[PDB]
Design an enzyme around this catalytic site. Sequence first.
Site, PDB file in Angstrom:
ATOM      1  CG  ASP A   1     -60.978  13.333 -27.158  1.00 45.95           C
ATOM      2  OD1 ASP A   1     -61.814  13.464 -28.100  1.00 45.95           O
ATOM      3  OD2 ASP A   1     -61.246  13.734 -26.218  1.00 45.95           O
TER       4      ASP A   1
ATOM      5  CG  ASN B   1     -63.235   5.772 -33.640  1.00 44.61           C
ATOM      6  OD1 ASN B   1     -64.394   6.130 -33.141  1.00 44.61           O
ATOM      7  ND2 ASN B   1     -63.414   4.541 -33.875  1.00 44.61           N
TER       8      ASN B   1
ATOM      9  CB  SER C   1     -62.584  10.517 -29.070  1.00 45.14           C
ATOM     10  OG  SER C   1     -62.241   9.700 -30.204  1.00 45.14           O
TER      11      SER C   1
ATOM     12  CD1 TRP D   1     -60.704  10.363 -36.399  1.00 47.20           C
ATOM     13  CD2 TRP D   1     -59.650  11.577 -37.863  1.00 47.20           C
ATOM     14  NE1 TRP D   1     -61.298  11.658 -36.133  1.00 47.20           N
ATOM     15  CE2 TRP D   1     -60.362  12.230 -37.042  1.00 47.20           C
ATOM     16  CE3 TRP D   1     -58.796  12.188 -38.637  1.00 47.20           C
ATOM     17  CZ2 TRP D   1     -60.677  13.593 -37.181  1.00 47.20           C
ATOM     18  CZ3 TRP D   1     -58.917  13.609 -38.681  1.00 47.20           C
ATOM     19  CH2 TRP D   1     -59.786  14.384 -38.385  1.00 47.20           C
TER      20      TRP D   1
ATOM     21  CG  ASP E   1     -63.633  15.098 -23.711  1.00 55.15           C
ATOM     22  OD1 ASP E   1     -62.455  14.553 -24.198  1.00 55.15           O
ATOM     23  OD2 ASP E   1     -64.495  15.527 -24.388  1.00 55.15           O
TER      24      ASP E   1
ATOM     25  CE1 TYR F   1     -63.760  13.499 -34.752  1.00 54.55           C
ATOM     26  CE2 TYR F   1     -64.154  12.660 -32.466  1.00 54.55           C
ATOM     27  CZ  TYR F   1     -63.471  12.532 -33.743  1.00 54.55           C
ATOM     28  OH  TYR F   1     -62.934  11.312 -33.977  1.00 54.55           O
TER      29      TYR F   1
ATOM     30  CB  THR G   1     -63.773  19.596 -23.490  1.00 52.79           C
ATOM     31  OG1 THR G   1     -64.497  18.551 -24.391  1.00 52.79           O
ATOM     32  CG2 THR G   1     -64.452  20.521 -23.365  1.00 52.79           C
TER      33      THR G   1
END
Length: 326
Positions: free
Chosen positions: A32, A37, A35, A39, A215, A75, A218
């Site tokens: 991504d 992060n 983004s 996780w 992105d 998100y 997406t």
Amino acid sequence: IGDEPLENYLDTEYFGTIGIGTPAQDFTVIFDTGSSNLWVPSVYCSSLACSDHNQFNPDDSSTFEATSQELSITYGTGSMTGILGYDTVQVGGISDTNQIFGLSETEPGSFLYYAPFDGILGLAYPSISASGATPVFDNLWDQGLVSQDLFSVYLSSNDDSGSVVLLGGIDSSYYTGSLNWVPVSVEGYWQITLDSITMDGETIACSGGCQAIVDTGTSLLTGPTSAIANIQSDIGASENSDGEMVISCSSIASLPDIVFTINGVQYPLSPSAYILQDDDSCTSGFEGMDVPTSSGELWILGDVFIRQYYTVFDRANNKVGLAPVA
């Protein structure tokens, strides 16, 4: 030079594998650029989405180490809640030591349940990082694990294999022509300035400019709901029975080219690209999504645009380089 292969999923989701801990526990994540992060589901997560996916068990990693830090992320599709912890992350053949990553506690909702992916690996600026958590590419650059402070991505077309993320490198093998570089508007997202949007020599949109992020997280080509109306109206899209905007799969033939001008350079989008299709039925790759920001209503350059243009994200000079794929 790190090399991380990605799985093209219905030309809609491009994920890849990583390992966390020692021994390494595998997880498929989305790379991504929208983004920052990282996780993965964890064993302290009872949500229907974690039962559905792999759960990181820190109790089984000898190099794991905890924090008091809670983390939360929203998100446009999923939501998440968890704790932060350090461990060694293995990406694109590189051992990313002491990477701070989140461990889910809640993964609420329906959408994260149907996903072929376990978690998410953001590749944007630490500016938009939740809990001010150090992104992976930043931790790699910082630990001098990569030669260059850039990364490049190749996305596959028609479900083919070949999708890759190149960490600290550029491969001329992926593009034709020369690399055009575009400066970054605002450091947060992979924010670029669009000059116009044409069709038939007519500026069908983005007059006087607009903002766009690149992105890879997406799937479609996204913009303000009013603006896209203009585009769908133009390619003859139809919000059908069941709630969708399809098109006569044969109407690809007549249809002109949607062109995007960035930094004055023309970047065409051929109908074989802007129209998605299964040998059964054709959809529009245009989606309306009002995304307000201090800067204004964001336009997102998703996988429809990225599949045709090899993108380089240069953190050194804060620019995005583009070139037609091979």
